Amino acid sequence: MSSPASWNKEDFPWSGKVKDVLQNVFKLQKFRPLQLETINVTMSGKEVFLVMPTGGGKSLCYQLPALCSDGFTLVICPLISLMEDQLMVLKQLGISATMLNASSPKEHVKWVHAEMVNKNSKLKLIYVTPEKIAKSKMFMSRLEKAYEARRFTRIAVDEVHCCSQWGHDFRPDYKALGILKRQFPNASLIGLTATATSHVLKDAQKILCVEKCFTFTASFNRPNLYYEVRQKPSNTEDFIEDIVKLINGRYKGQSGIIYCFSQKDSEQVTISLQKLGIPAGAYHANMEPEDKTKVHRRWAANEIQVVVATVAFGMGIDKPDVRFVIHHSMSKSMENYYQESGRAGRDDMKADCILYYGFGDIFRISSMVVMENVGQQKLYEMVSYCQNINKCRRVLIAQHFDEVWSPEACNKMCDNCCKEISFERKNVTAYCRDLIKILKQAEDLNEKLTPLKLIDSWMGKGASKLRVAGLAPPTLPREDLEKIIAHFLIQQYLKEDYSFTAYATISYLKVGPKANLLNNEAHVITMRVKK
Amino acid sequence: SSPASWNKEDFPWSGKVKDVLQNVFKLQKFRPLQLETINVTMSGKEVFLVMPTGGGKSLCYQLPALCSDGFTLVICPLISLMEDQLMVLKQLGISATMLNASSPKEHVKWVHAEMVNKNSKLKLIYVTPEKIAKSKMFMSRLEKAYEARRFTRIAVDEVHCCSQWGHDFRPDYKALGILKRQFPNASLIGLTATATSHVLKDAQKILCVEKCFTFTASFNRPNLYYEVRQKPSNTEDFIEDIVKLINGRYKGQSGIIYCFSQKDSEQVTISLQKLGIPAGAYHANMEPEDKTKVHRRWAANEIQVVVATVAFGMGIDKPDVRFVIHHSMSKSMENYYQESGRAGRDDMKADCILYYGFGDIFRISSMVVMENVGQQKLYEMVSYCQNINKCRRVLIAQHFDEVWSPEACNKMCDNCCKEISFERKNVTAYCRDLIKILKQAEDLNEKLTPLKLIDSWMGKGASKLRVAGLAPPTLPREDLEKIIAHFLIQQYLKEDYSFTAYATISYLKVGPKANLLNNEAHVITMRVKK
Ligand SMILES: Nc1ncnc2c1ncn2[C@@H]1O[C@H](COP(=O)(O)OP(=O)(O)O)[C@@H](O)[C@H]1O
Numbered sequence A: 001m002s003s004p005a006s007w008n009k010e011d012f013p014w015s016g017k018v019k020d021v022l023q024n025v026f027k028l029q030k031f032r033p034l035q036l037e038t039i040n041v042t043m044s045g046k047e048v049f050l051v052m053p054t055g056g057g058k059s060l061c062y063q064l065p066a067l068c069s070d071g072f073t074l075v076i077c078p079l080i081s082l083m084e085d086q087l088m089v090l091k092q093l094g095i096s097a098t099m100l101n102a103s104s105p106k107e108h109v110k111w112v113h114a115e116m117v118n119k120n121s122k123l124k125l126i127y128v129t130p131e132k133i134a135k136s137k138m139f140m141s142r143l144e145k146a147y148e149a150r151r152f153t154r155i156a157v158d159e160v161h162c163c164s165q166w167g168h169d170f171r172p173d174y175k176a177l178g179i180l181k182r183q184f185p186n187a188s189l190i191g192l193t194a195t196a197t198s199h200v201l202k203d204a205q206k207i208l209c210v211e212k213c214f215t216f217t218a219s220f221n222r223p224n225l226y227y228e229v230r231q232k233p234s235n236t237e238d239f240i241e242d243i244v245k246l247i248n249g250r251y252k253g254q255s256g257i258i259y260c261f262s263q264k265d266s267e268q269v270t271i272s273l274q275k276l277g278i279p280a281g282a283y284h285a286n287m288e289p290e291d292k293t294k295v296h297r298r299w300a301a302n303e304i305q306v307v308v309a310t311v312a313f314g315m316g317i318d319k320p321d322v323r324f325v326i327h328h329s330m331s332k333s334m335e336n337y338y339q340e341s342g343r344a345g346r347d348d349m350k351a352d353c354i355l356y357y358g359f360g361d362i363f364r365i366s367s368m369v370v371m372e373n374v375g376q377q378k379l380y381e382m383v384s385y386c387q388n389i390n391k392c393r394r395v396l397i398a399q400h401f402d403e404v405w406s407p408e409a410c411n412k413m414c415d416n417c418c419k420e421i422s423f424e425r426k427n428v429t430a431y432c433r434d435l436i437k438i439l440k441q442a443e444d445l446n447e448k449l450t451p452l453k454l455i456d457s458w459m460g461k462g463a464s465k466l467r468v469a470g471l472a473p474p475t476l477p478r479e480d481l482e483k484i485i486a487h488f489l490i491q492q493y494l495k496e497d498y499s500f501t502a503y504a505t506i507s508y509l510k511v512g513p514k515a516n517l518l519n520n521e522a523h524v525i526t527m528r529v530k531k
Numbered sequence B: 001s002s003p004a005s006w007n008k009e010d011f012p013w014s015g016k017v018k019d020v021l022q023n024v025f026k027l028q029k030f031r032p033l034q035l036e037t038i039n040v041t042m043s044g045k046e047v048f049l050v051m052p053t054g055g056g057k058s059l060c061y062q063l064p065a066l067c068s069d070g071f072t073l074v075i076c077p078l079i080s081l082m083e084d085q086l087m088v089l090k091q092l093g094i095s096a097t098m099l100n101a102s103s104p105k106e107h108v109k110w111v112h113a114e115m116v117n118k119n120s121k122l123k124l125i126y127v128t129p130e131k132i133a134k135s136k137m138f139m140s141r142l143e144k145a146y147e148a149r150r151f152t153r154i155a156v157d158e159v160h161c162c163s164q165w166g167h168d169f170r171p172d173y174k175a176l177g178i179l180k181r182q183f184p185n186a187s188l189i190g191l192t193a194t195a196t197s198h199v200l201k202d203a204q205k206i207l208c209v210e211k212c213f214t215f216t217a218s219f220n221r222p223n224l225y226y227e228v229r230q231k232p233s234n235t236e237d238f239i240e241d242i243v244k245l246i247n248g249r250y251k252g253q254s255g256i257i258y259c260f261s262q263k264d265s266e267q268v269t270i271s272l273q274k275l276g277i278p279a280g281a282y283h284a285n286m287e288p289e290d291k292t293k294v295h296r297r298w299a300a301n302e303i304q305v306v307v308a309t310v311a312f313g314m315g316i317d318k319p320d321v322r323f324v325i326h327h328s329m330s331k332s333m334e335n336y337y338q339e340s341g342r343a344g345r346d347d348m349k350a351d352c353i354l355y356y357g358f359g360d361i362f363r364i365s366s367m368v369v370m371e372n373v374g375q376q377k378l379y380e381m382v383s384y385c386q387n388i389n390k391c392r393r394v395l396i397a398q399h400f401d402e403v404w405s406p407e408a409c410n411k412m413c414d415n416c417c418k419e420i421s422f423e424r425k426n427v428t429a430y431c432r433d434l435i436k437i438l439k440q441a442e443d444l445n446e447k448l449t450p451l452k453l454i455d456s457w458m459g460k461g462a463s464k465l466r467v468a469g470l471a472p473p474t475l476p477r478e479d480l481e482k483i484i485a486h487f488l489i490q491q492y493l494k495e496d497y498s499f500t501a502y503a504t505i506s507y508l509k510v511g512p513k514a515n516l517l518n519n520e521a522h523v524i525t526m527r528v529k530k
């Protein structure tokens, strides 16, 4: 990555117009880190890649230069919902912008096509899907005439990581976006993304023929965020009651976000929150722009205090004063959890990120990510984070952001750093040999045990056909047995087995690959517990 | 992975395998690596087979399906490709079916029941990778079928699509690792035409195959005679030269003509039919009933020549194709090899004639603007057309990184058979001259198509440049065309594309290597005919 320090100045020829536009058009007071530096590189006509967390303020880095320049900026966006999010903001500020996609009606294409070459056009930003570049002969011809006419001046590729083959959400049409620099060399190009994945980045600039460009990365550590992991109650109504108790206790009247795993979860939490005295509203990426406005305005006006969102690509909820982000269920990955929880405290003031860890959520999420080649490994990293009690949470998260995370100290801004608790290693080897007996007897019977069935047999319940004769139940609460099995799953003494049923993927437990170590009587399985 | 140890017929299934080979598929012998690949699958191991298109990869999983219990699941990327297989299997009396996005509900219900029907005749089920990633119901039936020991084999056609290190990465191929993870006792076979060891090692990880045998076929087709001819300027004279060539050399024999565009194929077909050659056009998107008609008329010689257009999905496979004529050059050496490789599948001598046209360089270059390496891939083909001093197999082997020699070709290509005398010509003065016209075009602010700047070179075209004694070099047009093409490959000149309302257009400009002409000692040479 390049050093931005030299660009963190307001002594450029355009600096006066930039500060004008920032305050009197966008109605913002100061730049966030790396905004001015990225803008200055683009404004100087140079190529730049910006790596900044979701919610960090990337859009401004190309929207503002468009408003300070002649003509328009072409923005490459992967989703129509993402373009509508941007057009909603730009429309509210009184900025002329538009979009083109495959489903665009003919009368609108004819309009945009003509406005691109119209020297008296108000259009400053034109958002198009990569298909408009690869699979539209007509649009390219207008771009060529716009470019020759000095009206097409800048290129912005949002979600530039889609270019590379080794990154999230690869779009095939992004590969062809290298044509832009080859055909329009005097147009500066900016790449925006929240991953860092340096291979993905160095590769994206090669696909874009923008090799080596300035590459700026923001510091991903958010020192004002307090990270916490809580036990998720087994009872759904006890869980929603604990959430309402937590909101009124700590965050009385403050705006917050609740992330749910599923679309059903998000909707049912909202009505439960409403009954329990918390004004809440759901937000989804598939929503109509007028529905998104409905939520955004009620959230800003404190009509609804909590926005219950469901984890999906297209989340356009950004408020500067989000005081708490609660994860109703854990994320699919550590990278996802950082970005989702990172929507808190964008006003640089203290904000809490509360994660509710549930044993059942391990298998519900594992089953949903079965088709992702590394879905299980990525989820078990999240579960391992929930299980950790002896490491700073900021250190655990930073492990996934190695190139973009300052070593900067946590300063008691996570629960593990704050709690003055001692730990102790317990022997759980005999419990593992018990679980393997139950599972082997189910194999002899051709019975697949879910965690529910496996725990039930362990306790002396469930089908007596799945119980083992001499196996005394452990005399431990059901959630200690859950903790033990979760430990055996991460350490791969147990392993998941997926079963595809007509309507859903289901998780079963099976003898894991490390269970053979228990043939040597000297092998001891321990567990760190709170003392 | 040594195929020798597998090249034997002393397995328990060996009798059944020959039975099926001769009495169902009705082939007499195996082609190289077929028996070895079949033997590896039949013994329950994972195998990757790298074999050119048309080599006979499909049989390596279709035949084992007939000798095994239950059905074999085939992962295919295109609907047209699975229909190509389903047409053959129906002809041979083999029960096979397919599932796709457009599949009707009654056909899905039928397939779903046959998969769990212990007495079902379905031997092969062809599905798209979305049926694995995005169908709960199908995976549910696959699991039932697998537990009932009815789902025993997996075939992944175009297995290179798994790995993203390659340009044909199909996103849904990423999820195909679920198959080995969920169905470990089912052996998996990967079929591909792309050899690159880099992409194949990654695909073996994506598919979660630990012990994978890899068999690779050689590129060389020893019975194929490779030749490059000039493409005549007039379309009607060209089609006349083609008909003369068929009636002269290939009287009454089956052949293929490859065309660049959709209307080229249609225009060639009618010109052949009027000129006395029974011909038929073929496309990859065609109906399975139209493809059936073409193959049947071709076998019965109702149609002699099949005019095809270069595309992904061509199932024209006839063993006795005596000639393949390229009406226009292919877009790449990889395409030209596979397209010409459809000739002489009966191991008898077959001719591969490529017609090289200067204007075709830019027709193809403009059409491949969206391929990141479309231009580089085409210039290799143009370089092959330009070569006069090397064995064609040396140029082809160069494409696969193989080396070769004329002794290995043994008088089986035009450059090996027709020995012409040549000389290195100093064309640097021609290059400095060509740059002058292009610099003057910059001064007048308009740029040039390929047609223009031969005309200025010769003193034509609205008096573009007439200074510093640029008389025509006293060389024919076809020689001036070859000179510029050499200067395009060696990037003293470069292409400029312009996007117009209806098509992409190519212009020329001073290429990046023109700086070396500041050193007067720099000499640009080119071999020309004596
Ligand atoms: N300099 C700034 N000052 C205040 N708010 C900002 C600034 N830059 C961006 N924002 C706000 O941050 C929110 C999210 O920004 P966005 O463009 O979505 O970033 P990203 O594209 O990284 O998610 C927006 O609502 C925007 O108004």
Ligand SMILES: Nc1ncnc2c1ncn2[C@@H]1O[C@H](COP(=O)(O)OP(=O)(O)O)[C@@H](O)[C@H]1O
Binding pocket: B027, B028, B029, B030, B031, B034, B051, B052, B053, B054, B055, B056, B057, B058, B059, B317, B318, B319
């Ligand atoms: N051993 C063989 N002998 C004769 N013909 C064969 C043999 N194996 C395959 N073929 C024929 O070759 C043609 C093309 O085979 P195909 O399965 O399309 O190979 P690929 O999948 O590699 O393109 C088919 O029409 C088939 O009948």
Ligand SMILES: [Mg+2]
Binding pocket: A058, A059, A158, A192
């Ligand atoms: Mg963004």
Ligand SMILES: [Mg+2]
Binding pocket: B057, B058, B157
């Ligand atoms: Mg095939």
Ligand SMILES: [Zn+2]
Binding pocket: A391, A392, A393, A394, A395, A410, A411, A412, A413, A414, A415, A416, A417
């Ligand atoms: Zn900490």
Ligand SMILES: [Zn+2]
Binding pocket: B391, B392, B393, B406, B409, B410, B411, B412, B413, B414, B415, B416
């Ligand atoms: Zn030769």
